[PDB]
Design a protein around this nucleic acid. Sequence first.
DNA 1: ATTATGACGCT
DNA 2: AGCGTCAT
Length: 430
Amino acid sequence: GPHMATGQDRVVALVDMDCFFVQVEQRQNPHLRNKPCAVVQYKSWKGGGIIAVSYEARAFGVTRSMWADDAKKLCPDLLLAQVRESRGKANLTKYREASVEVMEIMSRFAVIERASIDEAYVDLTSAVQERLQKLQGQPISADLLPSTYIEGLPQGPTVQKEGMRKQGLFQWLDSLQIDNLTSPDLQLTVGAVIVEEMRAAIERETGFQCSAGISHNKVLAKLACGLNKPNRQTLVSHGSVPQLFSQMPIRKIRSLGGKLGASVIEILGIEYMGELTQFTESQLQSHFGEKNGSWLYAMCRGIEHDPVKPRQLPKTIGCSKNFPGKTALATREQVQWWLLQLAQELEERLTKDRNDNDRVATQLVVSIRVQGDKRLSSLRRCCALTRYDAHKMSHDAFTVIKNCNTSGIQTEWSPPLTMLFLCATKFSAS
DNA sequence: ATTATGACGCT
DNA sequence: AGCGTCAT
Ligand SMILES: Nc1nc2c(ncn2[C@H]2C[C@H](O)[C@@H](COP(=O)(O)OP(=O)(O)OP(=O)(O)O)O2)c(=O)[nH]1
Ligand SMILES: [Ca+2]
Ligand SMILES: [Mg+2]
């Protein structure tokens, strides 16, 4: 009843760039604009591996993780842009720099949490309070929400998609009580007005389009963002959660798309997120642990408390390369040459990071995979990172991994290495 | 032969 | 610390 917390205390948005690496390449090369196109890494093996796909290309069935040769079967006119290669490996600097462009615009509106190269959470609670005091009880025009969908609407008592969007928005706005400055629905709506402005600023100042979700917490904002892509934003109200969750597969909620989600489905004999409401908090804790159980109990009612962390910069800077099948490294000189390549890219990125962001990494993490292990990482070892020097970094990494070499022979490396990974961590202000 | 990252939880 | 999970 009156004491039952409803998780409506915050306004949280999630801004995700549409087909991000494709947009970066389309900005640079106008011949790729408004075309089926994809971004690929490498080329010799099966035409390269697709990592981003324009919405035009998605209509043909092209997806991430597909080999370009196979994508070309589905979409013979598909256009491809390749990720840059430097020191023998994929170099993602262009996309990281474009990400910084977007993140700096977003930071003008509110403190953001960088969730990935192309996605940021926004805590809009304070900005909404401010804009509400400016509004002075003035209603919110549909003209201020030109790309907003209201999830669950229209309902009750119409052919095209834009008309449907507008019908739902008008139902939502007509149900609004603008007199109450603590109405959660009003707060979400003002949040959506702000996100429209943020998205317009991103597109004006970068050329990039994005989608967004607006709700009361990060999980619902992320889910909302996915409902109407591309180039649209979606408001998920607290009241929309029972219907939305009643047919929502558990795997669609962030953090439940892997083994934990599969165990929720198997142990409880359910399919949809809304079915979780029928279990007590103790029951869920008994199956999934104290933390997961409390989180599931609240999540399935639309409640989640994870804060938007004030963090615009990545906490680690890392360099990784796979050496698949027959390209696995089998000589000491090979291992040393590739460690040096990785370390040179890392030194370049670290030196730029130190100049831009007034910080220095203090720990170097070295990870490898050996042929045969089905795990991502076979071994992970840290050492001190005391100087930004690639030869020192690569010598140190070799020192911490050299004992994995089973080969009695000094020159050979056995079993061959199928992955190398260097990561700088534990930053301190400088 | 899916590749290149990145965040966070567990013990 | 080192490993595992999850995301994409
Ligand atoms: N190197 C590499 N980059 C990846 C991989 N998966 C995704 N990315 C990059 C390329 C994407 O453009 C970018 C952002 O990923 P998203 O999941 O947000 O997808 P994207 O923005 O492409 O499409 P969207 O409109 O959000 O569905 O991250 C991967 O496996 N490897
Ligand atoms: Ca995206
Ligand atoms: Mg994203």
